Design a protein around this ligand. Structure first.
Ligand SMILES: [Mg+2]
Ligand SMILES: [Mg+2]
Ligand SMILES: [Mg+2]
Ligand SMILES: [Mg+2]
Ligand SMILES: [Mg+2]
Ligand SMILES: [Mg+2]
Ligand SMILES: [Mg+2]
Ligand SMILES: [Mg+2]
Ligand SMILES: [Mg+2]
Ligand SMILES: [Mg+2]
Ligand SMILES: [Mg+2]
Ligand SMILES: [Mg+2]
Ligand SMILES: [Mg+2]
Ligand SMILES: [Mg+2]
Ligand SMILES: [Mg+2]
Ligand SMILES: [Mg+2]
Ligand SMILES: [Mg+2]
Ligand SMILES: [Mg+2]
Ligand SMILES: [Mg+2]
Ligand SMILES: [Mg+2]
Ligand SMILES: [Mg+2]
Ligand SMILES: [Mg+2]
Ligand SMILES: [Mg+2]
Ligand SMILES: [Mg+2]
Ligand SMILES: [Mg+2]
Ligand SMILES: [Mg+2]
Ligand SMILES: [Mg+2]
Ligand SMILES: [Mg+2]
Ligand code: NA
Ligand code: NA
Lengths: 152, 54, 266, 72, 118
RNA sequence: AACGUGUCGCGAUGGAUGACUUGGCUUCCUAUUUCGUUGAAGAACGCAGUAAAGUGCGAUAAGUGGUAUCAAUUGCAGAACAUUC
RNA sequence: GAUGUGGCCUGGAGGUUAGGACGAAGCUUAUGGCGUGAGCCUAAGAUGGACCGGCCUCUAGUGCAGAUCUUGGUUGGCGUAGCAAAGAUCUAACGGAGAUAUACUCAACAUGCAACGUUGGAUACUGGAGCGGGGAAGGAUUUCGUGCCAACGGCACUCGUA
RNA sequence: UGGAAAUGGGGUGCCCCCACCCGUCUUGAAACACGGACCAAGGAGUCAAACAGACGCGCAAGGGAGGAGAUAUGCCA
RNA sequence: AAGUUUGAAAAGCACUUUGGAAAGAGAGUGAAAUAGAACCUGAAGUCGUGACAAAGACAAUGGAAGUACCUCCAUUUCAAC
């Protein structure tokens, strides 16, 4: 078993995924979730504008004590950020899904994202040095991402 | 309580039990039937060797 | 005697926010500072380690052993008890089953099988053969791979013969001079199926004695006296002599009706 | 057999019949026959009269075979 | 015989090369049994066999290798294709095959004389 | 509204349980059974066509000689008395 | 605190009676039924792949919620505290996948950001008790060339004592 | 005779009423008394000897070994 | 500390295509890939996603008795019965 959900019509759908991405899971969770119901072209425009810092990514769940901004009002929030490392990773994933649709013989201008899921992957371990001769964990948290889109 | 019992003298205050710090001092008889068989076999073989002497 | 205690462990004492269990000394490994010397610690000593001077064997009174053997032999001659134990005896001509002594002259397993088919023990032999299977549980890894039922036991007067019977699966062989209770009552249940030869059947009386004559082999042994002369107590309870003295049967009150009886005097 | 002991019945009782107050400690009254004249005097005097003292003459090297003498 | 399953299995899987030769034997055909009065022989390179068990049942071929390290023999006609199209052999346990023609040498003929049942 | 709560289907992280066992522990037996200055036990350095560890071996170095057997060893090279070199 | 229970449950032994590739053990549950209860049984698996149930006796390393309990894993705090001594970098051209990366509209800005090595310029610091040039103790290939960027250099790398 | 009705179970929400946090020492705990982030696996009245009482079994003015031997016996501790 | 316990057999995924690569989407081997390499089974705890139930602030959990809605559960009945 691969994907937690199944497209309505398989012959008019494209899929993509990536494992052990080495981006912060909490940052990638917010970046991927905002495009869940959007058309493919509209999702790609949003990521370009986030890199230009004219629009932001809303942080809805993992947002404890982050800054407030005026660009979060269009999402009905007050807190948002511009995580560039997560954005460029999601840009590559959309290109792969677009390539799969063209190979099948579909129109990328008529595709709508219908499924986005981000999960925690296995962690990697480093160490840090504290006062009074203590050693304490210094961990990294990568993530898995999967998605598919369907033609309207 | 203690009640009415015999005054005990069980004599087990030396290091007789083998444990993690003591070798112990015990003797078991788990080889008794094997030794009985061995002795009978040796007697039969010796009789065959010294035949016909009693 | 050394298992679980081959460490130089010591307790750290109070003042450090840890339990007072002894801990492994040293450093540089994953086991440094770990608990030791305890039935609850990983790698520790078990509680009450087993010893080799446990009481493994038992003593039994000689008279009680002889009594048990006699009872098993007596039970083997009741056809209902044999069926209850579980042997298949439906075509057997007679219990106790006694056959001629010429079977000791056989030399071929084919002849032995022909004799078994003639005497009609082949049903029990087939039961034993069909019951063979692989044991359930851990025992199959400890040289106890297969299990099967117990079949008929053939009693011989001496050690001669038995050449043609040794390889038959499901048939036990016994010598009348040394009868074993573990084979006469397997699992503690009486009623083994026994096939006697004439010579052993004749030797039985001299071996075990009677109620009045002592045994020739077992010095000063006689069969135990029964506690009851007649064990059919139902016949006694229904005999005419008892019914003569039993109390008369009286007439009882009528059974209560379906309607509830009244309880209110006023 | 271990299956007939009181431990099997006491699984789950948390105290095994020794109480919450007194508890089950190591040696609450000394080891063996200690205190026979001090704090076990009543037990020794009422159940074992004649435990302490000396009596009679001594016989250093006793041989029982010359003393064998059964009766009927 | 060996009442210890642990000891019996250890001897089988740690057997030397010359012991594995005897353990990897195969039965002879009915025609060959009548001729030599021998029920079975160890398998040798350049023998003719026929497969009696498995998916390759009924196939015939010539023995090309007795591996003896993987407890298998290799037959020329028993093979399959890989992903890239090349052909590889498939190992069959000797107790599943039957010998139909023996490779005879002077030493081999002496062995058959020793095992004659007549 | 959003955050948050609850139940169900699916999916992650994690490595318990069951089955398996060339290991351990324990108990017995047999005998032409007990090392070294004729240099032992232990320590070091080396040896393969390809060879780090381990195993075996000592400049005759993953081994020479003899007896038995009877066609392999194998990851890949390489070699090729069967009368048994 | 004492005692009773043809009272429940677990690993093995002597008997007896059954089951299993038309699917054993194990595992999952808005699967019900039974019992005052410990528990037992059936159903389903769009789970699994080779063993195992009942009854009578025997036997024991035989039942867990907590011991500042042992070992392994996980977790809220939390994208939070922070990553602030030793003054500092700027520019163009080469190199590189690391860009000038767009569905419509459209001239360009308001829709691909940030970051890297080398060379040439510019600006600074060390200031001869030196982030100069050589040795002892200690270390033992860290030295040199070519290649490479999974992990490591608590940010980064096309660079490196990797 | 059905995508049926009915009666019991099971699940989630809601209404009225009721209802202090477990384990422990203590005369007295819910407590401003101690141990208590979550889960899995592990974790504590055992073995031997002397004595006594109750209960089961054999024999009885007698009861019973132990060590050892002998031959069935050379499969069988 | 640590069972290299995939599978009967490596038959250990040729080839197309998107990507710098890691990899993804197809195709194929195999009875099974939900057996894809330290790969049998794959629990608890914690997390993501979809559908649904609702819900002020009475910390949450809990008892007793109803009701609204649901029910891959059980049993009964369906004709002068
Ligand atoms: Mg702050
Ligand atoms: Mg620090
Ligand atoms: Mg008192
Ligand atoms: Mg241990
Ligand atoms: Mg008590
Ligand atoms: Mg007290
Ligand atoms: Mg030399
Ligand atoms: Mg056990
Ligand atoms: Mg549930
Ligand atoms: Mg225990
Ligand atoms: Mg537990
Ligand atoms: Mg900060
Ligand atoms: Mg700062
Ligand atoms: Mg600071
Ligand atoms: Mg500074
Ligand atoms: Mg740029
Ligand atoms: Mg420059
Ligand atoms: Mg200097
Ligand atoms: Mg870094
Ligand atoms: Mg309460
Ligand atoms: Mg007080
Ligand atoms: Mg309290
Ligand atoms: Mg108070
Ligand atoms: Mg205290
Ligand atoms: Mg006497
Ligand atoms: Mg599988
Ligand atoms: Mg698995
Ligand atoms: Mg889970
Ligand atoms: Na005591
Ligand atoms: Na100067």
């Amino acid at each position: 078993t691969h994907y937690s959900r199944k497209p309505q019509v398989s012959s008019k759908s494209a899929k993509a995924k990536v494992s052990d991405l080495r981006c912060h899971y909490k940052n990638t969770f917010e970046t991927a979730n905002v495009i869940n119901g959007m058309p493919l072209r509209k999702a790609q425009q949003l990521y370009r504008q986030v890199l230009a810092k004219t629009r932001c990514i809303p942080f809805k769940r993992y947002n404890g004590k982050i800054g407030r901004t005026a660009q979060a009002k269009e999402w009905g929030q007050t807190k948002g950020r511009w995580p560039r490392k997560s954005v460029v990773a999601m840009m590559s994933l959309l290109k792969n899904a677009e390539a799969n649709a063209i190979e099948k013989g579909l129109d990328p201008n008529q595709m709508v994202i219908k499924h986005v899921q981000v999960d925690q992957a296995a962690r990697m371990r480093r160490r840090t040095y504290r006062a009074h001769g203590r050693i304490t964990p210094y961990m990294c948290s990568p993530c898995h991402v999967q998605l598919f889109m369907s033609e309207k | 309580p203690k009640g009415n019992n015999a005054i005990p003298h069980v004599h087990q205050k030396k290091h007789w039990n083998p444990c993690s710090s003591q070798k112990g001092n015990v003797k078991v008889f788990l080889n008794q039937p094997a030794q009985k068989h061995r002795r009978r076999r040796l007697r039969l073989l010796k009789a065959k060797k010294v035949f016909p002497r009693p | 005697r050394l298992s679980g205690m081959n460490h130089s462990a010591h307790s750290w004492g109070t003042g450090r926010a840890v339990a007072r269990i002894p801990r492994i000394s040293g450093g540089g490994t994953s086991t440094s500072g770990a608990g030791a010397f305890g039935n609850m610690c990983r790698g520790g000593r078990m509680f009450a380690p087993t010893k080799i001077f446990r009481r493994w064997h038992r003593k039994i009174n000689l008279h009680q052993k002889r009594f048990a053997v006699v009872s098993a032999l007596a039970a083997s001659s009741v056809p209902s008890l044999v069926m209850s134990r579980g042997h298949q005896i439906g075509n057997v001509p007679e219990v106790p089953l006694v056959v001629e002594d010429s079977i000791q002259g056989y030399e071929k397993t084919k002849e032995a099988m022909a004799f078994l088919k003639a005497i009609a023990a082949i049903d029990d032999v087939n039961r034993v053969n069909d019951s063979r299977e692989i044991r359930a549980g851990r025992g199959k890894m400890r040289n106890r791979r297969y299990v099967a039922r117990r079949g008929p036991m053939l009693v011989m007067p001496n050690n001669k013969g038995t050449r043609a019977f040794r390889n038959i699966f499901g048939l036990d062989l016994a010598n009348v001079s040394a009868l074993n209770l573990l084979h006469l009552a397997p699992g503690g249940h009486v009623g083994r199926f026994v096939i006697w030869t004439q010579s052993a059947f004749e030797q039985l009386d001299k071996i075990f004695g009677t109620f009045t004559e002592a045994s020739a082999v077992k010095k000063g042994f006689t069969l135990p006296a029964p506690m009851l002369t007649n064990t059919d107590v139902t016949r006694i309870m229904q005999s005419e002599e008892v019914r003569r003295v039993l109390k008369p049967k009286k007439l009882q009150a009528k059974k209560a009706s379906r309607f509830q009886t009244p309880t209110n005097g006023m | 057999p271990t299956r007939f002991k009181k431990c099997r019945h006491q699984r789950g009782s948390t105290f095994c019949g020794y109480g919450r107050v007194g508890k089950h400690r190591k040696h609450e009254s000394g080891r063996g026959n200690a205190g026979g004249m001090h704090h076990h005097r009543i037990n020794f005097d009422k159940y074992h009269p004649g435990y302490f003292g000396k009596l009679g003459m001594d016989h250093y090297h006793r041989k029982k075979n010359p003393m064998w003498k059964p009766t009927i | 015989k060996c009442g210890s399953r642990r000891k019996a299995r250890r001897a089988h899987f740690q057997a030397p090369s010359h012991v594995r030769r005897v353990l990897m034997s195969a039965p002879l055909s009915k025609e060959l049994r009548a001729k030599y009065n021998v029920r079975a022989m160890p398998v040798r390179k350049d023998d003719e066999v026929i497969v009696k068990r498995g998916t390759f049942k009924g196939r015939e071929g010539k023995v090309t290798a007795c591996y003896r390290l993987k407890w298998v023999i290799l037959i020329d006609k028993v093979n399959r294709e890989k992903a890239n199209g090349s052909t590889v052999a498939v190992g069959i346990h000797p107790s599943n095959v039957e010998i139909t023609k023996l490779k005879l040498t002077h030493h081999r003929k002496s062995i058959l004389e020793r095992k004659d049942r007549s």
